[PDB]
């Protein structure tokens, strides 16, 4: 028992992180097979970032201008290509430590693990969620660009995120591994507002299920509700409207706990209206929304990876 | 910027986890060099755990009764020894993936990363702290025993924790890697009460520094205080008494922020007396105490490991 924000074991991704330098700029790349993936803004100076023309900046770069270092090993770049907001560097050596992998573009609400890296070296691992406004709330300092987010399934690593920017508000923006940003963000040092950060309702419900499984039952109430009545409340508190797909995803947890989804929604309603009255749920004094239904089933049934 | 509970990258420890089976019991071991370390209660049935005589139970076991599996590889056990509450199994093969490592016994307040494992396979990684009552607040299901806690420094993995028990209250107890339990706990299925779980004051202060570094400044107040006056408050709220060693450890963070330790203590005081009035600090609605001063300096200056 107990319930923790828990990352995937990072070892498969550690073995893929390299350092990429171009002129004076150093950041992280991901070395899968014989291709190194990195933020295209590796070709930029501090000044370029104010208003980069990436196509023009890229012209003044050749293969040899990209230094790729895996630990101390220097990799040889024999080809480069810009794909959306990421550079692909062809190298002469396949990564021996390449795992089974896929590139996925995730939907808002889905969670993943970040391996925060500096100079091609891993420093730490934490969980986060793709927010409904296409930001993440990470921990990223200068040099962290190219750090990646992922999920693991048995032996397959699904990369879903590459870190590119911090917005002036201090939240984080980046791309999938095809180089398309999540949301409206651009790789330019200009003003960019996020948008309303709505709570991921289906995640909060999952976490309520988790609490119940773990003996934290005080918030269960006598009431039920309707999808429409609940959603009236959700919309007042900037909660994502709950859909019948959401109800479906919560079915297994409903089944294990014997608590119908809508009963759980009525508990949520009363929490939103009355607050927590200074109590906690699973050691938090606010409603947590960065656990997916899958995250809870995982942690509650001890799923394992190779 | 941003501040997250962040584990060490787990890859060095992944490569050390094996599965240990003895009769009907399976749990995790740690394979360092040619020795496999595991909870001695691997020799116990469910019934034995009510009142085990480990010395007597161990007599009816030979080398061949310990099956050790690293992935699919079966390791050969050529020697066994019980040291406190852990078994050491000598195997005929040195772990090729053995890192530089040490065994450390940590002090209350210190944090570490847990790699939660089942059947010798890693499922996830999270941070926790050794509490002042020698428990940890983990996430552990059946089969998790032998999962380890650690810290990394450059290339050296310091193991400080092996998971052994869940107490009837649902918190977690275990040993250092010499097999000595943290606290008064025993490897027997009997009633065991934890003790008062006091807040780790020096950690809360660190996390206040962290918040300030990250722009969360609302709780800074006009006041200062004294060690004795603060401690009068700490003792009322079940906070660890702050010592001058604590003040010393916070010096670098005091220096970076220009906020004297005792000014920060007076802010804490007012938080303890007035609550948070429904605001948050670094996205929490309560005072967090599982970041060490070191943890904050780490995350705030991007320290890296090989």
Curated annotation (Swiss-Prot), chains A, B:
Quote the annotated effect of residue 49 to A. Answer: Does not affect ability to cleave and inactivate human TRMT1
| UniProt note on regulation of activity | Inhibited by pyridone-containing alpha-ketoamides compounds 13a and 13b. In turn, alpha-ketoamide 13b (tert-butyl (1-((S)-1-(((S)-4-(benzylamino)-3,4-dioxo-1-((S)-2-oxopyrrolidin-3-yl)butan-2-yl)amino)-3-cyclopropyl-1-oxopropan-2-yl)-2-oxo-1,2-dihydropyridin-3-yl)carbamate) inhibits SARS-CoV-2 replication in human lung cells. Inhibited ex vivo by michael acceptor inhibitor N3. Inhibited ex vivo by compound 11a and 11b.
**Where would I find the Peptidase C30 domain in this sequence?**
1-306
Cytoplasmic-side segments: 1-306
Residues involved in crosslink (Glycyl lysine isopeptide (Lys-Gly) (interchain with G-Cter in ubiquitin))?
A: 5, 90
Catalytic center residues: 41, 145
Compartments in which it is found = Host cytoplasm; Host Golgi apparatus; Host nucleus
> Which superkingdom does the taxonomy of this entry point to?
Viruses
Enzymatic reactions: TSAVLQ-|-SGFRK-NH2 and SGVTFQ-|-GKFKK the two peptides corresponding to the two self-cleavage sites of the SARS 3C-like proteinase are the two most reactive peptide substrates. The enzyme exhibits a strong preference for substrates containing Gln at P1 position and Leu at P2 position
Query: How does this polypeptide assemble, per the annotation?
Result: 3CL-PRO exists as monomer and homodimer. Only the homodimer shows catalytic activity. Interacts with host FBXO22; this interaction promotes the proteasomal degradation of nsp5.
Described function: Cleaves the C-terminus of replicase polyprotein at 11 sites. Recognizes substrates containing the core sequence [ILMVF]-Q-|-[SGACN]. Cleaves and inactivates human TRMT1, preventing tRNA guanine(26)-dimethylation of tRNAs. May cleave human NLRP1 in lung epithelial cells, thereby activating the NLRP1 inflammasome pathway. May cleave human GSDMD, triggering alternative GSDME-mediated epithelial cell death upon activation of the NLRP1 inflammasome, which may enhance the release interleukins 1B, 6, 16 and 18. Also able to bind an ADP-ribose-1''-phosphate (ADRP).
Per its record, how is this protein called by name? 3C-like proteinase nsp5
Residue numbers of the full-length protein present here: 3264 to 3569 of 4405
């Amino acid at each position: 028992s107990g319930f923790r924000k828990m990352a995937f074991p990072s070892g498969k991704v550690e073995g893929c992180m390299v350092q990429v330098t171009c002129g004076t700029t150093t950041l992280n790349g991901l070395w899968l097979d014989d291709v190194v993936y990195c933020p295209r803004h590796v070709i930029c100076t501090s000044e370029d970032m104010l208003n980069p023309n990436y196509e023009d900046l890229l012209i003044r770069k050749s293969n040899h201008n990209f230094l790729v270092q895996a630990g101390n090993v220097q990799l040889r770049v024999i080809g480069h290509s810009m794909q959306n907001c990421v550079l692909k560097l062809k190298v002469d050596t396949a990564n021996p430590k390449t795992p089974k992998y896929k590139f996925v573009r995730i939907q808002p609400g889905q969670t993943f693990s970040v391996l925060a890296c500096y100079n091609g070296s891993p420093s730490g691992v934490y969980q986060c969620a793709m927010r409904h406004n296409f930001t993440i709330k990470g921990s990223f300092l200068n040099g962290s660009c190219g750090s990646v987010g992922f999920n693991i399934d048995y032996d397959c690593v699904s990369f879903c995120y590459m870190h590119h920017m911090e917005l002036p508000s201090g939240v984080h923006a980046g791309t999938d591994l095809e180089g398309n940003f999540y949301g409206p963000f651009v790789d330019r040092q200009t003003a960019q507002a996020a948008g309303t950060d709505t709570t991921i309702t289906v995640n909060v419900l999952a976490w309520l299920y988790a609490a119940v499984i773990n003996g934290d039952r005080w918030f269960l109430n006598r009431f039920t509700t309707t999808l429409n009545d609940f959603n009236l409340v959700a919309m007042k508190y900037n909660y994502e409207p709950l859909t019948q797909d959401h109800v479906d995803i919560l079915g297994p947890l409903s089944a294990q706990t014997g608590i119908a989804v809508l009963d759980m929604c009525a508990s949520l309603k009363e929490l939103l209206q009355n607050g927590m009255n200074g109590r906690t749920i699973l050691g938090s004094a606010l409603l947590e929304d960065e656990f997916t239904p899958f995250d809870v089933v995982r942690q509650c049934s001890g799923v394992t990876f190779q």
